[PDB]
């Protein structure tokens, strides 16, 4: 009585024939993971940025980004180890656009086909210029489309509690992180990490879009990360003493978010987060092994103009120089402290 | 890489045909949903109740249960609407159990096509006695196989937030609780009433077992569940006012949870707030039009080694039978109460 109907759906294995990777985005998607393996379980002293559009709702002006970033990542790689955000999926706080394969002309008509289709392309074309992607792990049947290309997941703040999103993660061949809960502390993040490193049995769709029973082994390169949230930021040294004390035995490093929560409702804040959050690397915080900015070519954002989000707020492609080149620096710093 | 395999599973078509529902099963599942929209919208000035054990592992003593509680039920039909708690999937705060479903054996053999054949095998014994039932719709796959006999849905504190979980209660045929989170706090909850009123585009599963494109049409019977948590309990007067406070026009009536959040760690609890809601009905509070309650046949729970005891919870704490028969005849005379204070 509530279901409107049912629309046939393409299956992930006839998308993925029907969109091939390219040879460069299969191995760029697995350097992106070995790499981002090696900083969060402490292999590598480079710290890893997640950073880019809050949302992705334009291949071309994506493309245009991801040269950009292709470009300055190739400039601070001794240093940083870059993954473009493009982010297919977007929570709501209640209704509104949820991104591009939900609703790819975003104008309401929901042709999920056409948005696994672009979403497929956008994937294929980001990676197929040496640049890594990750996305946030929303829905539970989509990466079955995409995860072939995909080096980093995240599990947004409003789902890191889920035990489907934890199960999810459990069996993704890439490292995830668990943004804290919306309230602002760590302990869900924490369980969820526990949670996901361990092995889960769960009815999931396949590649042929059939539901079948997954086992998974269980997902060890699973990471906090700090968002910010009702009861406070939490990018500062307090802050970080605090998460260190609640880690497990076995945890990976930490990820700070300069947006969402941490920029407390202002897009501008995200380089003053990037002071507080350099001053403590380069002073020898070696906990901190992942930051994550919201950037695009153009600042801020718009309601429902090129390279101006359309979701959250984000600093410009200026702005990002500045920070991720003074985030580099920092890096540089603390292996001084550390030697 | 991190997929150890994929095992065959029964389509929600097949299982439906396997393990049919009886015509009994049927009409007491379309009741049961009837009764408590009523009730939930304001047409009828019971309570429904939504009681019964935190999880079911044992299909035999959930029987006698819910033998038990249709007698009472019958006795206290006029100011009570009873819903069976027949909770098939439990959220764990890290790992653990996840219920009959997903280990029907309680051993880590995780055999889920016996998990969903048990879980509607359960669902056709308990609704074909005229008890309706209600669980949490954990699982999104799961209701395709289920969702014929089931009168409430909860979506629990721990998903409420989930974009997931709010497309899914869009599409569900029953009413649908959502608890508030587990800070306590509540707007998550409203805000999820509000987004499973719409409808929603998603990929599902179908009958057919296959991967689809669905399209909801909106939940207009999603109700906030006060389930207290780290901010406190938030079951009293005040705080229940500061959730009507919050609720927006064309809202449904509020839901006290006495368990989880609310019990602040103890089981014998419940009856205390019990009380305190029983004296804000009795006293002409018409936005409180549910509550839920654990309940057993047996008090408190028990670790899992079968070894089990009889009628004793492997999840969450209850209170047993006894006590369950005193909290709502107390419940139920409060309701009377109430219509003497509205005429
Ligand atoms: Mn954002
Ligand atoms: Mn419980």
Same mark, same amino acid.
């Given at each position: 009585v509530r279901i409107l109907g049912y629309d046939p759906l393409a299956s992930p294995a006839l998308l993925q024939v029907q969109i091939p990777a390219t040879p460069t985005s299969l191995e760029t998607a697995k350097r992106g993971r070995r790499e981002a393996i090696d900083i969060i379980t402490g292999k590598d002293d480079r710290v890893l940025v997640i950073v880019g559009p809050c949302s992705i709702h334009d291949l071309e002006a994506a493309q245009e980004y991801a040269l950009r970033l292709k470009k300055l990542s190739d400039e601070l790689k001794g240093d940083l180890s870059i993954i473009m955000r493009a982010y297919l999926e977007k929570p709501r706080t209640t209704v509104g656009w949820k991104g591009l394969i939900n /609703?790819? /002309?975003?104008?309401?008509?929901?042709n999920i086909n056409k948005g696994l289709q672009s979403a497929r392309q956008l994937f294929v074309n980001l990676t197929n210029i040496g640049l890594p992607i990750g996305s946030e792990?929303? /829905?539970? *049947?989509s990466p079955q489309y995409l995860a072939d290309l995909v080096s980093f997941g995240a599990i947004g703040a409003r789902t890191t509690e889920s035990q489907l999103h934890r199960e999810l993660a459990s069996g993704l061949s890439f490292p995830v992180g668990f943004k804290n809960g919306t309230d602002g502390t760590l302990n869900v993040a924490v369980d969820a990490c526990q949670a996901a490193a361990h092995s889960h049995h769960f009815m999931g769709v396949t590649k042929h879009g059939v539901a079948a029973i997954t086992t998974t082994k269980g997902n060890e390169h699973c990471f906090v990360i700090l968002r910010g949230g009702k009861k406070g930021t939490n990018y500062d040294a307090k802050s970080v003493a605090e998460a260190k004390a609640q880690l497990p035995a076995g945890s990976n490093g930490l990820m700070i978010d300069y !947006?969402? %929560?941490?920029s407390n409702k202002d897009f501008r804040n995200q380089p003053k987060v990037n002071d507080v959050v350099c001053e403590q690397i380069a002073n %020898?915080?070696?906990?901190?092994?992942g930051v994550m900015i919201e950037s695009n070519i153009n600042e801020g954002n718009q309601g429902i103009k090129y390279g101006? !989000? *359309?979701t959250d707020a984000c600093i410009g492609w200026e702005t990002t120089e500045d920070v991720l080149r003074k985030l580099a620096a920092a890096v540089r710093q603390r292996r001084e402290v550390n030697k």
């Open positions: /609703d790819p /002309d975003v104008n309401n008509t929901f792990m929303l /829905d539970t *049947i !947006s969402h %929560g941490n %020898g915080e070696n906990a901190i092994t101006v !989000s *359309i």
